Design a protein around this ligand. Structure first.
Ligand SMILES: [Mg+2]
Lengths: 84, 193, 241, 67, 1338, 48
RNA sequence: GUGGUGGAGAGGUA
DNA sequence: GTGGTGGAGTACCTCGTTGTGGTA
DNA sequence: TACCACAACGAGGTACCTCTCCACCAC
């Protein structure tokens, strides 16, 4: 027998802005995916109404503020670091 | 090199992106050697000079060229590192001293195909066969056959049957010696004597 | 068939055929000077003429005449093996020059003679030597055939393998094609008595060996299997008689 | 000759009832209960039945009466 | 016999009636003791005997008593097969909920209990209680509560408030439903509320209650107390060599559920803790769920294998998903297969056959014959001779083969020609010899195709094959009358080569007395095959029917054509072969001969023609060499010019004067033009590449380059392929669909660079990848089509309806796309046909249009006709034979019993694989005529037409419209109606570029409310580009100016108020934003003045979208009722333009949200059928507003556009038949005899209306609206549930049948298929007719 | 947020750089690691 | 008076 | 050999309906 | 209160050929 070399996606971060009719509008700078070599994949969705949603691989859309607060950044410190 | 299997796309997630050739496949994955049928493009074959990187990506050989002279040094390069360099086709006019004499030479700056000036080229390929597969390299006059028929020709070449008394093809691509040696079916002198 | 060339745009057949004709001509030629008991010098100079023509490079005069050249000619007597790279390969004019060197017709085409009528074909045809392969698709393992045999225990239907002496499946598209014709008796036959009728297959065997073709209809057991499983799904199923 | 399945199909203008009567005639042949009013040319009951109907010498009345 | 298969729910009583036992032991057969266990999954007490006619202890080994039950051996002695019918039950410790009725999209139990499935899911898992018998307490029946609330409620109430939890609570709810009382309450409540959603829910409740009451079904049976067990044979476990056993999934599921039930009973009898007992109840509920279905909730898995367990629903689905392999596929005996091989020595009706396949297939026939003639006395001897193959067996084998037709089919059968009958011929080999002409029908090349064989056994089947499926019978395509047994590549090459002319050839100019003389001269070799010669010939002409007129005529022809004519039958003029005989010419000649001479002679001609084509192609030394591809000398110069130009353009871009985007388009245009020039030059070079000398001066003639005949003859190849072969290959396209800015200058003879090959690889891989997905999509589409139209069969002979379709030649564009005669061929008329002068009956009535009649119509100036269609033919349950046109595979009219629906579906779906403006400019010189034109002449007579509906037709001198043009709103036209306009004239000078606001009134207007900044703005462009005032936007205006709208009050020049005709208000249309009022306020404007100016896929997906009639994302907004239109109120955000019809003002006019742009002009004629705002065209609103025939025409044109784009030809009969299948259902508005709103079969409506007319009251007759259904939707809504069950949604449709208690009378094709009965259509029509006769009549 | 705001460009999975080819060693090591963690948890349960 | 194949995976042909 | 049976590793289509809880 | 985003179900081509490989535990 022989083992055929598998060509697969390299683990890491990937940013997608593929236009889709999901927004029913022009386009969306779509989500980004971080893929681990082993573990869960975190997804950072971008809501059509200029909002950022974050979910685990098998979890529903949740706002990124939850993840920011869980990371320990303050609701204002995180904003001051990111938005400004 | 296949794309199915664990951690890989199934045949129900085919789409088109995985099943299509991109300029980044140049010299790394054979663009024409792949089985026609349900698994097309999903399961491909490496180029003749293909090479995995330390990081597992694909690297391809090229000769560094000075603005005039073609330096004999040879470098293996991955797709991401090919962006800056302007790559010239392996066949081009030469001044018998390494100087590209053509005025407008076909090149690829950032994976788009156009002509350029010899003063602008930075890398140029090793051999024209560095794009096709091993089976794809074995069809003579391949430059005169369309891509579909090349694919089928490779595929049936993969399914030949050894005859009672094999006879060497009168027309060959020179690669037959290489593949014959590389396959273990031939007894090879481990030590000279 | 030449007509397969222009549609499937692969000219490599024609160029390969021409070059192979040239190669075989050269092989026969060197065979004749070898049979003419030519001295080694003639063979060496002719070979150099071959290898100085267009591309690659000769390496002779580094080979001992009587040993190396004679062995090479003996091996080459069956035809000179050409080596053409995928894209750095032989140009058309190179093949043409070799052909005229091979004393063969320049255009690579000659008028042939019919092998039965003896009449020469009016137009010259392309002939030559082409590397032909035989694939692992021989009919000996493809010819399956079934009259009757074992059937699946669940549904009394022929097994599906040539290995299992199985019968082909008359897929749903086949039955559509059948009903597109007005042919319904054959459809009912192949649906019921040719397959999935325990009490029909035996009796039509009796009829056939008796020479009668009557084919009592019967009732497929696959449908009653569906009935049984639907009933096991807690769904009442019955016929109004 | 051969089966005149085209001209006879136009006479009845059905090409289905033709098959029906043909089946009954061939069964009459196989059962031996009747004679081929067409002279046999060494062939099986189906084709002789097709010739019988094609020549117009047998029809629904003829089949029923011969029954 | 039997009939009328039923569906019902399982009553535990009748379940036990079914059951032969109560399985209590989860374990099955003992491996150690080779026996099943009492109360096991295979217990003989329940299911029957292992070996036939035996008892457990073997006490009764005798076969005499086949029904007795022994004393020690309790299990009754009986036949062994009874293990397949006998079933058993399981007695459950608790009632458990059925999953299907719960997890189907409408939760049946939730619908019956009138609350959401969340609540029952809660209760099913013992999460919340529910009140039973609330009595006189604060609790209520629907109330559900938690543990703390439960304890509090028990404390406060104590009794008269029973709280329950679990599936048993649901069961107690079900039998306490008061179906009559609930139905009465729902009926009372339904009209009380006018809200749409609530009335919809109440309607569904009433439907369910009525179905239950009429069906006699008890809802309490929904939650089963006991469940049946599958008979052991259908769930067998098989052992393998080495002591391995392989058990079915159903056995594992049964073991699991029995285990859990035993757990429940034994923990229950000792009164286990309540938490533990409810937990076990829950796992038993989950286990029975997983048994009866899988993947819906839990997705149960097997042990040490990732493959999910295959539950019962997976069995009922069958293999291949829902397309039941066991039920419809059904592998067939007396079958075989092998690779094909071309047999050119084969007559059309015959095919080759390997000896071994023949002797294997016909083995019972061999046995019968051998026993008959006497060389076989025992069958062992017969087997002995057949295995040794004595020379004797070949004689009998040939005899049985002699007149036995054999049945052949390829793997992908896309139409009835994909499977054909042949008369086999024995050959020595292992391959199947095939007739070369039939390969086109099979679409089977000899590149390795395998061909499946079958043999018909009954005389019925053999006659069906010989008379209906013989290759000779089917010559013309069922899709279109064009022949399908047509000369292919090589024979076409031979024929074309024979029929050429050489300017100077041996023997030209000398004459022949007869064709035989020509053959004698040519075979002697003293005459060239193609030289201009004279020959007198004997042509038999059938110009008048009944007399075959023979005449002799001396003709100047070539030798080859004269030789060919000897093959042609005696019913055609010789002139039909005097031309070059290309492939299309050959097809036309074959079609002509078939319709003239007949069929037997037609096939004789076909075989002879093949023989001649093959022979003289063999004689011809036609061959391909590298010299054949000719590269024009000008190609190098053209390429150099293109390179120089593109280098100059690149330099210009680099200088910055040229932008990148414009440069890309410029260079691709340059390259395309250069490629076209190269292709044209090389084609001209090749075609005329022949210089010959004819007795002195050299001359030129048609080329004889081999590849040139390959192209021109049409045998093989195409101009595009020549372009790639001997010419520069043009632009290749990137994967994004963008054309690469650098082309491939080289051809294939020249060879390609690695880069150019790389790009060609992009293209080729694109095509190859798309191929498989296209095939899959086409397969799905054709399966849906055949399933939605399987039942439709020609049943009646003449409906007699006088409705048809006004059907005209395809004129789209400036040129005639499709001639009228070709469209009407094979159809039948629906009314009189008249001369241009009326009252002159040309074609009287429904007479079938034939070749004579189409030529007659061409003789006259017929342009528009109305033809009977299956959209007509109101006959119930079928289709009359007139409204469906002539049969396509037959020159004759269709016959009753022809499954046109299946034929139509196959024809439409077969070619799926092959798929993927200012002014009016007249084309030619013709008389100008106006259609649907409504406009008043301008002051100068410009006659600007602001009306939307209007078209311009350029009638020919005969009178027919050779072209038609659509006139846009606001089009100024040089109106000379009837005057011949020279070709290329621009008669109408429309130039919208904007939405102009016409002014049919005259005088000095008063632009009231035109505030400069609040409503208008005198903003002028640079260089005095305009002296105008631009209206202010409703948002960009001031806060008060936002509500201010400009209004040009219609005043005359002196001050007289002007008002629009019909309605008293002035034509003072508001001047919205982005308008252009260049006319000065108070300036008298002539009639038709532009007051305000407001500036404004294909392939299988398109046809699938049409066949589903899916609503586009933004459909074109269409008018409702004709009349006076109004303006929309943007304040609400939805433009409410009220309609004021003049005959009667109906204010009902919906408001279109401004999110979509509306191009409608306020205060105009509504034109009910017309479009208010542009966009893609929706189908349903055309059906409900424009009518039926209009919708059918639009759909047919839309589909045929896609099909004609690829050049594939299909008769409109098939698409129209599909359309008839779509519209089989109607919706009712006011019934008086049925529900208010119901999608019901139009047959039901017709029957009910006819009965009610001569019935109770004349007012009981119902008013209903026709409704359009997509094929997938329509097929699932068939009267017969079985067909939908075998199609898709098997769970859903089965649940509908169960809850509705449906009864299916097998009156469709697929039903008689699955049951194994004869087809209602075809030859089984007589059998079905007699069955109906004997059943209905006593 | 930069990509959404126009700073930078989206990634393209077409680039063979974004993909990677494994080799028998990689999946062999992965299977060995999986078996190793199973044996390790077994030992930790036992060697406690 | 008696007659012997599930599922998964992979590849290939048309 | 003959009773007896529960979760850390996996998530990577593509429409097209259909039903549902949210907001104007 | 009628649209509407969102989630779940349900479909996604025929036929044929070749190979290997098949629940654990556990006194
Ligand atoms: Mg083929």
């Amino acid at each position: 027998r022989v083992i055929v070399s598998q060509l697969h996606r390299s683990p890491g971060v990937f940013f997608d802005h593929d236009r889709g009719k999901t927004h029913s509008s022009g386009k969306l700078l779509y989500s980004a995916r971080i893929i681990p070599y082993r573990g869960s994949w975190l997804d950072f969705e971008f809501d059509p109404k200029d909002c950022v949603f974050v979910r685990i691989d098998r979890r529903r859309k949740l706002p990124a503020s939850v993840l920011l607060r869980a990371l320990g950044y303050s609701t204002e410190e995180i904003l001051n670091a990111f938005y400004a | 090199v296949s794309a199915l299997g664990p951690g890989g796309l199934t045949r129900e997630r085919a789409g088109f992106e995985v099943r299509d050739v991109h300029p980044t496949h140049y010299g790394r994955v054979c663009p024409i050697e792949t089985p026609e049928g349900p698994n097309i493009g999903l399961i491909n074959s490496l180029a003749t000079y293909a090479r995995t990187n330390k990081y597992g990506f694909l690297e391809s050989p090229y000769r560094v060229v000075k603005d005039s002279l073609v330096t004999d040094e040879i470098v293996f390069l991955s797709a991401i590192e090919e962006a800056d360099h302007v790559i010239a086709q392996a066949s081009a006019t030469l001044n018998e001293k390494g100087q590209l004499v053509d005025e407008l030479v076909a090149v690829r700056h950032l994976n788009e195909f156009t002509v350029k000036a010899p003063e602008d080229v930075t890398l140029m390929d090793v051999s024209p066969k560095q794009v096709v597969s091993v089976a794809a390299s074995l069809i003579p006059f391949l430059e005169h056959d369309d891509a579909n028929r090349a694919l089928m020709g490779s595929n049936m070449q993969r399914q030949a049957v050894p005859t009672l008394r094999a006879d060497k093809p009168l027309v060959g691509t020179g690669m037959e010696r290489n593949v014959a040696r590389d396959s273990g079916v031939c007894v090879v002198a481990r030590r000279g004597g | 068939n030449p007509l397969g060339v222009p549609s499937r745009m692969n000219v490599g057949q024609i160029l390969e055929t021409h070059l192979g004709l040239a190669a075989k001509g050269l092989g026969e030629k060197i065979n004749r000077m070898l049979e003419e008991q030519r001295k080694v010098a003639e063979l060496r100079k002719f070979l150099h003429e071959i290898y100085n023509e267009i591309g690659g490079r000769e390496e002779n005069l580094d080979e001992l005449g009587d040993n190396e050249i004679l062995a090479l000619a003996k091996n080459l007597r069956g035809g000179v093996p050409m080596a053409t790279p995928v894209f750095d390969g032989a140009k058309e004019r190179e093949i043409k020059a070799m052909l005229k060197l091979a004393d063969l017709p320049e255009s690579g085409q000659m008028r042939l003679f019919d092998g039965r009528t003896g009449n020469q074909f009016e137009r010259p045809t392309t002939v030559g030597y082409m590397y032909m392969l035989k694939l692992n698709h021989l009919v000996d393992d493809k010819m399956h055939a079934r009259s009757t045999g074992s059937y699946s225990l669940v549904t009394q239907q022929p097994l599906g393998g040539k290995a299992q002496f199985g019968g082909q499946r008359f897929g749903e598209m086949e039955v559509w094609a059948l009903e597109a014709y007005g042919a319904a008796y054959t459809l009912q036959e192949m649906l019921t008595v040719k397959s999935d009728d325990v009490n029909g297959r035996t009796k039509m065997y009796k009829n056939i060996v008796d020479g009668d073709h009557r084919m009592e209809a019967g009732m497929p057991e696959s449908f009653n299997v569906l009935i049984k499983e639907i009933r096991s799904l807690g769904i009442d199923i019955e016929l109004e008689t | 000759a051969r089966v005149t399945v085209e001209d006879c199909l136009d006479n009845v203008d059905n090409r289905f009832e033709l098959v029906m009567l043909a089946t009954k005639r061939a069964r009459q042949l196989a059962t031996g209960g009747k004679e081929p009013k067409v002279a046999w040319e060494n062939d099986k009951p189906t084709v002789v039945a097709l010739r019988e109907i094609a020549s117009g010498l047998v029809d629904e009345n003829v089949v029923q009466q011969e029954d | 016999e039997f009939d009328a298969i039923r569906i019902g729910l399982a009553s535990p009583e009748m379940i036990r009636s079914w059951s032969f036992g109560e399985v209590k032991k989860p374990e099955t057969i003992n491996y150690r003791t080779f026996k099943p266990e009492r109360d096991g999954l295979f217990c003989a007490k329940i299911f029957g005997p292992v070996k036939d006619y035996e008892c457990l202890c073997g006490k009764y080994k005798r076969l005499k008593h086949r029904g007795v039950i022994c004393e020690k051996c309790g299990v009754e002695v009986a036949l062994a097969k009874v293990r397949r019918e006998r079933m058993g039950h399981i007695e459950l410790a608790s009632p458990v909920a059925h999953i299907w009725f719960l997890k189907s999209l409408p939760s049946r139990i939730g619908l019956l209990l009138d609350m959401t499935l969340r609540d029952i899911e809660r209760v099913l898992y013992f999460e919340s209680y529910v009140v039973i018998d609330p009595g006189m307490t604060t609790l209520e029946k629907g109330q559900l509560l938690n543990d703390e609330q439960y304890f509090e409620a028990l404390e406060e109430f104590g009794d008269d408030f029973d709280a329950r939890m679990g599936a048993e609570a649901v069961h107690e709810l079900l039998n306490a439903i008061d179906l009559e009382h609930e139905i009465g309450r729902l009926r009372e409540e339904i009209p009380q509320t006018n809200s749409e959603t609530k009335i919809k829910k109440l309607s569904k409740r009433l439907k369910l209650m009525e179905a239950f009451q009429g069906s006699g079904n008890k809802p309490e049976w929904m939650v089963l107390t006991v469940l049946p067990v599958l008979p052991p044979d259908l769930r067998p476990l098989v052992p393998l060599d080495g002591g391995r056993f392989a058990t079915s999934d159903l056995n594992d599921l049964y073991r699991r559920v029995i285990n859990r039930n035993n757990r429940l009973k034994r923990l229950l009898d000792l009164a286990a803790p309540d938490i533990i007992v409810r937990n076990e109840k829950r796992m038993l509920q989950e286990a029975v769920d997983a048994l009866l279905d899988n993947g819906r909730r839990g997705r149960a898995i097997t042990g040490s294998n990732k493959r999910p367990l295959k539950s019962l629903a997976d069995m009922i689905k069958g293999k291949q998903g829902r397309f039941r392999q066991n039920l419809l596929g059904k592998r067939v005996d007396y079958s075989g297969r092998s690779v094909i091989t071309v047999g050119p020595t084969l007559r059309l009706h015959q095919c080759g056959l390997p000896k071994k396949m023949a002797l294997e297939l016909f083995k019972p026939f061999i046995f019968g014959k051998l026993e008959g003639r006497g060389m076989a006395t025992t069958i062992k001897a017969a087997k002995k001779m057949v295995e040794r193959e004595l020379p004797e067996v070949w004689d009998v084998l040939a005899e049985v083969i002699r007149e036995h037709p054999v049945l052949l089919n390829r793997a992908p059968t896309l139409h009835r020609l994909g499977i054909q009958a042949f008369e086999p011929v024995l050959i020595e080999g292992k391959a199947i010899q095939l007739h070369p002409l039939v390969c086109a029908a099979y679409n089977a090349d000899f590149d390795g195709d395998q061909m499946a064989v079958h043999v018909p056994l009954t005389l019925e089947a053999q006659l069906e094959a010989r008379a209906l499926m013989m290759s000779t019978n089917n010559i013309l395509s069922p899709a279109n009358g064009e022949p399908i047994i047509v000369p292919s590549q090589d024979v076409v090459m031979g024929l074309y080569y024979m029929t050429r002319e050489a300017i100077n050839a041996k023997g030209e100019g000398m004459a022949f007395a007869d064709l035989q003389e020509v053959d004698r001269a040519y075979r002697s070799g003293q005459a060239s095959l193609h030289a201009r010669v004279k020959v007198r010939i004997n042509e038999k002409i059938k110009g008048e029917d009944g007399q075959l007129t023979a005449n002799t005529r001396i003709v100047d022809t070539t030798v080859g054509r004269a030789l060919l004519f000897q093959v042609v039958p005696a019913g055609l003029p010789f002139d039909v072969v005097n031309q070059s005989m290309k492939k299309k010419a050959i097809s036309k000649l074959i079609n002509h001969c078939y319709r003239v001479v007949g069929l037997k002679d037609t096939v004789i001609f076909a075989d002879q023609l093949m023989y001649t084509g093959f022979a003289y192609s063999t004689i011809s030394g036609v061959s391909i060499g590298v010299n054949d591809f000719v590269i024009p000398d000008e190609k190098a110069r053209i390429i150099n010019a293109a390179t120089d130009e593109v280098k100059e353009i690149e330099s210009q871009y680099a200088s910055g004067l040229v932008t990148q985007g414009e440069k890309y388009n410029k260079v691709i245009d340059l390259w395309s033009k250069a490629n076209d020039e190269v292709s044209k030059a090389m084609m001209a070079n090749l075609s005329k590449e022949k210089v010959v000398d004819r007795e002195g001066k050299e001359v030129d003639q048609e080329s004889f380059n081999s590849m040139y005949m390959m192209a021109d003859s049409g045998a093989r190849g195409s101009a595009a392929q020549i372009r790639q072969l001997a010419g520069m290959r043009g632009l290749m396209a990137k994967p994004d669909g963008s054309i690469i800015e650098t082309p491939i200058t080289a051809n294939f003879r020249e060879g390609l660079n690695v880069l150019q090959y790389f790009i060609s690889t992009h293209g080729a891989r694109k095509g190859l990848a798309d191929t498989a997905l296209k095939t899959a999509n086409s397969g799905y589409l054709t399966r849906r089509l055949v399933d939605v139209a399987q039942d439709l069969v020609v049943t009646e002979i003449d409906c007699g309806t006088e409705h048809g379709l006004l059907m005209s030649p395809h004129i789209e564009g400036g040129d005639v796309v499709e001639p009228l005669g070709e469209r009407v061929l094979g159809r039948v008329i629906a009314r009189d046909v008249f001369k241009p002068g009326s009252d002159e009956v040309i074609v009287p009535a429904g007479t079938l249009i034939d070749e004579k009649w189409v030529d007659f119509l061409e003789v006259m100036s017929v342009d528009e006709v109305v033809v009977r269609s299956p959209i007509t033919c109101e006959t119930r349950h079928g289709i009359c034979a007139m409204c469906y046109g002539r049969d396509l595979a037959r020159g004759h009219r269709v016959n009753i019993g022809e499954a046109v629906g299946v034929i139509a579906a196959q024809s439409i779906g077969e070619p799926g694989t092959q798929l993927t403006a200012d002014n009016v400019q007249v084309k030619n010189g013709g008389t100008i005529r106006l259609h649907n034109l409504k406009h008043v002449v301008r002051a100068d007579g410009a006659l600007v037409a602001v009306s939307r509906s209007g078209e311009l037709a350029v009638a020919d001198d005969f009178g027919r419209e050779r072209e038609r043009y659509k006139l846009p709103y606001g089009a100024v036209i040089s109106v000379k109606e009837g005057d011949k306009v020279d070709p290329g004239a621009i008669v109408a000078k429309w130039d919208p570029h904007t939405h102009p606001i016409v002014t049919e009134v005259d005088g000095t207007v008063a632009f009231v409310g035109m505030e400069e900044g609040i409503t208008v703005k005198r903003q002028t462009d640079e260089l005095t580009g305009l002296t105008n005032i631009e209206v202010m936007d409703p948002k960009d205006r001031p806060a008060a100016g936002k509500d201010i709208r400009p209004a040009v009050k219609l005043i005359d020049a002196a001050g007289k108020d002007l008002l629009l005709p019909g309605t008293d208000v002035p034509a003072q249309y508001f001047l919205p934003a982005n308008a252009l009022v260049n006319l000065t306020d108070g300036a008298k404007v002539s009639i038709g003045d532009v007051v305000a100016r407001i500036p404004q896929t294909g392939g299988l997906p398109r046809v699938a979208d049409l066949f589903e009639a899916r609503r586009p994302k933004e459909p074109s907004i269409l008018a409702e009722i004709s009349g006076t239109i109004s303006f929309g109120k943007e304040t609400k955000g939805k433009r409410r333009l009220v309609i004021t019809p003049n005959d009667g003002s109906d204010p009902y006019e919906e408001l279109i949200p401004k999110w979509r742009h509306l191009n409608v002009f306020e205060g105009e004629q509504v034109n009910r059928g017309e479009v208010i705002s542009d966009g893609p065209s929706n189908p349903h609103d055309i059906l409900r507003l424009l009518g039926v025939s209009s919708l059918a025409k639009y759909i047919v044109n839309e589909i045929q556009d896609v099909y004609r784009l690829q050049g594939v030809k299909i008769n409109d009969k098939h698409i129209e038949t599909i359309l008839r299948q779509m519209l089989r259902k109607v919706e009712v508005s006011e019934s008086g005899d049925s529900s208010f709103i119901k999608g019901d079969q139009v047959e039901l409506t017709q029957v009910l209306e006819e009965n009610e007319q001569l019935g109770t009251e004349d007012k009981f007759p119902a008013k209903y609206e026709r409704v359009l259904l997509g094929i997938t939707k329509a097929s699932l809504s068939t009267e017969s549930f079985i067909s939908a069950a075998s199609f898709q949604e098997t769970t859903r449709v089965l649940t509908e049948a169960a809850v509705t208690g449906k009864r299916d009378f097998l009156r469709g094709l697929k039903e008689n298929v699955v049951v194994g009965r004869l087809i209602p259509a075809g030859t089984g029509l007589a059998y079905h007719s007699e069955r109906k006769r004997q059943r209905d009549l006593g | 947020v930069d990509i959404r705001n126009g700073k930078g460009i989206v990634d393209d999975i077409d680039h063979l750089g974004n993909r990677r080819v494994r080799c028998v060693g990689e999946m062999a090591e992965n299977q060995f690691r999986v078996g190793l963690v199973r044996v390790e948890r077994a030992v930790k349960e036992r060697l406690s």
